[PDB]
Amino acid sequence: MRRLYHHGLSPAARKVRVALAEKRLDYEAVIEETWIRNESFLAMNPEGEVPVLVEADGLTITDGWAICEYLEEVYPEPSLLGGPAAMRAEVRRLVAWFDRKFNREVTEPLVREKLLKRVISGGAPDSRQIRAGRANVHTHLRYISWLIDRRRWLAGDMLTYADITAACHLSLIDYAGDVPWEDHPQAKEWYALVKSRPSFRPLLTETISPIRPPRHYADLDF
Amino acid sequence: MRRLYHHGLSPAARKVRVALAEKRLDYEAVIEETWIRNESFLAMNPEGEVPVLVEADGLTITDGWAICEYLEEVYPEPSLLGGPAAMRAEVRRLVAWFDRKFNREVTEPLVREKLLKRVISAPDSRQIRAGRANVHTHLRYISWLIDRRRWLAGDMLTYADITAACHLSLIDYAGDVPWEDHPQAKEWYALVKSRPSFRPLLTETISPIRPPRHYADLDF
């Protein structure tokens, strides 16, 4: 049956999991710990990253963006890009905002230092990287608050890959306990709406050993 | 006429310039040096990056990838993604290979240390040697792909070839591509660089850096 190679620390893989659920597509979730070399996995994806989607006929789609665009092409409804070219471009802009800018400024340092290092032998957290990530998340939350104060969802009138991408990144910052939610109440409210959707539920209930998420992480009413 | 905000040190902007030309879309190239703060540019693109495409009617498309997907949706022929879902997915896989992996391993350190630092104002030699070592791995992969396909993603030129060639064109501007170790990849790069869509990348300069002698040479 359709399968997704993933791991809980990957924002892109989280995004694909949420997308598959939003599209009502059944799949088998298969963990690959990409920090442990596996020649068979590399043979399937030479980049050695998750996510990788394998359809029941064996068709193998690699890269989060490639998978997301493939899902919209093959399983068009419900749409996660929207209809007019201009709207789709705004969705894609915001996808890039989070998968590049937020990712580089916040997700990469906090996930690496607070989550991945504890999962592997990795060693001492780098406090400098952590402080920068913690400071930078404020600018992003202010932007989210600005967008959602004037739009229904981050990219406009319907939930899209923009909301999914932003929420999946934030979910990992939240797993680490580093989101200053109460400084950004409009962003907090938007995240509560996303986190309460059935597509988000596995991200809330699953854990990544040996890190215990914070007590509010799975609270819909946080 | 549509306008593209770009600069020569941006692989994403280079890619869009090539794409626009491949699709026979005229445009005005407008330089924005994004290392110099400009509130008006930020007001148009809050990320403060190039590329940004502005259509004649004012429609503003931001982000290289968003621009490429937009161009294929609005100007479908000639296609730079291809037709079947599987092919399009392979193109997008390779676009990511270059815009993520090659970019992190090779373009970022070499452009930063050798090009950007000279444009603004000491190169880190360790980072330069890491970039130079890693480009070999990527060229071997290119060579593997084009030994069995005409172009990186299959039988037709796509965003995959454009993205790879645009990244490599910046490495080549810095003089750091070991072409003599990778003759199959070299031959593929010569074909892409020779296309009319690539011409401005070859002839334009980024002050104060001079490119190597062969950089603009089709017969290198």
**DSSP result, A164-207:** HHHHHHHHHHHHTT---GGG-HHHHHHHHHHHTSGGGHHHHH--
Residue of A nearest to B47 (CA): A97
User: Are B54 and B20 spatial neighbours (Cβ–Cβ below 8 Å)?
Assistant: no
Pairing of β B60-62 and β B52-54: antiparallel
Rounded to 5°, angle at Cα B93 from B90 and B94? 90
Q: Which of A16, A92, A104, A145 to mutate to test the interface with B (most CBs of B within 10 A)?
A: A92
Residue of chain B with shortest Cα separation from A91: B66
Residues 161-200 of B with CB under 8 A from A: none
CATH 1.20.1050.10 applies to domain B78-195? yes
- Interface check for A57 against chain B (CB to CB < 8 A): the answer is no
3-state secondary structure of B131: helix
B98 in reach of chain A (CB within 8 A):
no
Contact A103, A11 (CB under 8 A): yes
One-letter amino acid for residue A170 of the chain: L
CB B46 within 8 A of CB A77: no
CA distances from B191 to B184, B185, B198, B217 (A): 11, 10, 10, 12
CA closest to A97 among chain B residues:
B47
Taking contacts as CB-CB distances below 8 angstroms, the residues of chain B near A89 are 61-62, 66-67, 69-70
CB under 8 Å to B52, separation ≥6 — which residues? Answer: B4, B5, B32, B44, B45, B60, B61, B62
- Residue A63, token pair as written in the block: 């890269």
Other CB atoms within a 10 A radius of the CB of residue A196 amount to: 12
Angle at CA of residue A19, ends A13 and A23, nearest 5°: 150
Q: Looking at residue B196, what DSSP letter applies?
A: G
Burial B6-34 (b: 16+ CB within 10 A, else e): bbbbbbbbbbbbbbbbbbeeebeeeebeb
C-beta of residue A56 within 8 angstroms of C-beta of residue A46: no
Q: Do B73 and A85 count as a contact with CB atoms less than 8 A apart?
A: yes
Angle between helices A85-96 and B64-74 (to 10 degrees): 160
CA B41/CA B38 separation, integer angstroms = 5
> What strands lie across the sheet with B28-31, from one edge to the other?
B28-31, B3-6, B52-54, B60-62
Q: Do B141 and A86 touch (CB under 8 A)?
A: no
Amino acid found at B30: V
SS3 B195: coil
- Give the angle subtended at the CA of A16 by the CAs of B51 and A53, to the nearest 5°: 105
Tokens representing residue A172 in the block: 């990992």
Q: Which amino acid is at B209?
A: I
DSSP-derived 3-state class of residue B33: coil
Helix, strand, coil percentages (3-state) for chain B, rounded to 5, are 55, 10, 35
CB B3 within 8 A of CB B56: no
DSSP 8-state symbol, B103: I
Quick check: bond before A198 cis, omega within 30?
no
Cβ-in-10-Å burial (0-12, 13-18, 19+) of A131 comes to exposed
CATH number, domain A78-197: 1.20.1050.10
B interface test, pick of A52, A53, A54, A65 with most B CB neighbours within 10 Å:
A65
CB contact under 8 A, B65 and A65: yes
- CATH, domain range A1-77+198-222: 3.40.30.10
Q: Using an 8 Å Cβ cutoff, are B136 and A86 in contact? A: no
Q: Resolution in angstroms, to 1 decimal, for this deposition?
A: 1.6
Any chain B CB within 8 A of the CB of A47?
Answer: yes
Separation of alpha carbons B86 and B92, rounded Å = 10
Q: Is A129 on the interface with B (CB under 8 A)?
A: no
For residue A56, report the phi and psi dihedrals to the nearest 5 degrees. -55, -30
Where do the domains of chain A lie?
A: 1-77+198-222, 78-197
Q: Name the residue of chain A whose CA is nearest to B101's CA.
A: A47
* Nearest alpha-carbon partner for B110 in B93, B89, B134: B134
Counting every residue, how long is chain A?
222
Tell how far CA A11 is from the center of its chain. Answer: 3
Annotate B153-180 with b (16+ C-beta within 10 A) or e (fewer): bbebbbbbbbbbbbbbbbbbbbebbebe
In 3-state terms, what secondary structure has residue B152?
coil
Architecture label for domain B1-77+196-220: 3-Layer(aba) Sandwich (3.40)
Report strand pairing: B3-6 vs A60-62. Answer: unpaired
CB-CB contact of B11 with B166 (8 Å): yes
Q: Measuring CA to CA, which residue among A54, A63, A109 is closest to residue B98?
A: A63
* DSSP for chain A, written as a single string: --EEEE-TT-HHHHHHHHHHHHTT---EEEE--TTS--HHHHHH-TT--S-EEE-TT--EEESHHHHHHHHHHHS-SS-SS-SSHHHHHHHHHHHHIIIIIIIIIIIHHHIIIIIIHHHSS--S--HHHHHHHHHHHHHHHHHHHHHHHHSSBTTBSS--HHHHHHHHHHHHHHHTT---GGG-HHHHHHHHHHHTSGGGHHHHH--BTTBPPPTTTT-TT-
Give the residues across from A3 on adjacent strands: A28, A54
Q: Kindly report the CA angle at A45 between A39 and A48, in degrees rounded to 5?
A: 70
Interatomic CA distance for residues A156 and A35, integer angstroms: 37
**Where do we find the tokens 């071997």?**
B140
Q: How many CB pairs under 8 A join A and B?
A: 67
Q: How far apart are CA A41 and CA A49, in angstroms?
A: 9
Tell whether B61 lies on the interface with A, counting CB pairs under 8 A: yes
Helix residue ranges per DSSP H, chain B = 11-22, 39-44, 64-74, 85-96, 108-111, 117-120, 125-148, 159-173, 183-193, 199-203
- Is there a contact between B61 and A97 if contact means CB atoms under 8 Å apart? no
Q: What is the DSSP letter of B170?
A: H
Q: What angle do CA A171, A177, A178 make, to 5 degrees?
A: 85
* β-pairing verdict for B28-31 and B60-62: unpaired
Selection from A21, A7, A2 nearest residue A195 by Cα = A21
Cβ neighbours of A106 (radius 10 Å): 27
Residue B155 and residue B11 in contact, taking contact as beta carbons nearer than 8 Å? no
Alpha carbon distance B8, B12 (integer Å): 10
Distance from CA of B97 to the nearest CA of A (A): 7
Spatial neighbors of B3 by CB under 8 A, at least 6 apart, are: B27, B28, B29, B30, B53, B54
- Residue B102: partners with Cβ closer than 8 Å, 6 or more residues away: B138, B164, B167
Q: Please name every residue paired with B3 in a beta bridge, in sequence order, or none if there are none.
A: B28, B54
Which of A34, A62, A102, A154 is the best residue to mutate to test the B interface, defined by the most B CB atoms within 10 Å of its own CB? A62
